[PDB]
């Protein structure tokens, strides 16, 4: 009866691993964030807008570094905010971005590289 | 009366008239406020306490007594009142 | 020099430097009561800076 | 060469991107980011005055009245132009910025593996930000610049590390001072021994080093100082001040710092946010008392970039007041300028957006400190 | 009541033996003057 206010789901490292190992058809965007990081407030609003634009044509998820610190380090996260763009084609390699990139830049990566 | 209450405070509540080593400002406050609010100080204690508000006057007073400054600093940490009867251990 | 600038209204010190004297020596915090002693450390005030105004800026520009 | 003297910032130009990431034990709601500002005014200790990319220092240095040039590489795409247009707007020299038309700015190609039942990534192609070559260095900048500034983020890239030490050689040949602003990224917090080996070569080349309190304790012994802070006398305090249960502002002795000291080091600064600036020279040491007030503006406070403003304020005064290295009283007065710059930087959302000007910083310094400390 | 303010900077000069010590209602030491005391400020 009441629509939820937030579209981006928070996933554990174990849940994210199964999502990556499993079969996917849409691009997978993974956000690493922390509630204490100031720029993550700005990034959180951009990814919610990106989820609205890509209703079912993309899957937007987020991972907290306070809960999955070891997982983030193994994923080569050097700082926050960090985004991973994972293609549904298993041969293509993922794209890792750093910093508050513009919303249009995210769309170009998803459309042209994902 | 004000003899049993004092004894009661000593025995039941552990009262003792412990020495209070006051600064010249604190010593002047207690001696002057007993006279009034804004009045000419008349008692010799409050008049002397008014003079002692200046450390320069204290140094002049100390020299006239022939003692050093540190000795005067030690004389203020002295037990006041009467002394107990000296011990006689047999 | 002085007393001619003063007569004409030309710029000059308000007090003649020749007829200007020091204020000797005053109480040095040991001959003073507690309420008249200078604090050992300077105290923050919120009034410690001079208020800016138009007059200060114009006077400096006219001085140059 | 015009005045003020030029400064060069070396590394990657990024928008925001806080590098120093550790684990905090007080998380807010994972979705309601309106609660996250409460962590800006009760921050983790490693995030009290966070640093950032070297481009933040260059921008902040120019706003404080200095002149700065950025040395690095961006891609030939649209986001690369936006970063360059950001630094040109802030009047940062960009002749030292090289374009790589075949790369995408701030984009790293990585491959995902599933080693020992866990998900890991490995770098396939580094971004243009971490791919500046030695032949691409602008030697006119390195000749003119009096301070060469870089962070430890360049040590995470094999290409930049080789390029970094060629830039240092040229800068020293031309008499420039080397400023190492540590700002340890996430990987370098894993273990003390691996990090000390990784940074030792760059540590020895530096004439000026700025580290946070957390970084310094991590490099020496993290558990010893944590135990030291948590000690409470069992029966009575050793002095009256210990009874007040005040915050710990421990000043490290120069003998504790000795494992990190070398011959060419002129000034070591340890920052406890903007609250304390511990300084160490070959001749003397001491602490500058500062302050912070983010609760004065609870809805616009943001600590990101305040570490860069402090570093920029230090470089602003070092270039124009060379006697800071030898005079302790002069050094303390000039470091209070850096404290004021850090305070203002915490009053605005966004690092670049909130960097203060010189006159605003000078005004705050005179308002906060009594006139005898100016 | 009326407050007398110093018209110039300078050094106060008077004979403290002509006045009587007192404590004010603000807790400060002061002197009570029962005569026409002459106080000098050397500016």
XYZ file of C-alpha atoms in Angstrom, chain B residues 25 50 53-57 59, chain C residues 27 29-34 37:
16
model
C 41.597 37.528 50.141
C 42.977 44.899 54.697
C 45.753 42.277 50.761
C 48.996 43.607 49.234
C 51.913 41.125 49.170
C 54.298 44.097 49.273
C 52.981 44.934 52.745
C 57.092 41.313 52.698
C 51.742 49.571 40.915
C 50.744 43.759 40.851
C 52.533 43.201 44.171
C 51.500 46.535 45.709
C 47.984 46.146 44.278
C 44.758 44.603 45.507
C 43.509 41.480 43.755
C 45.902 43.163 39.121
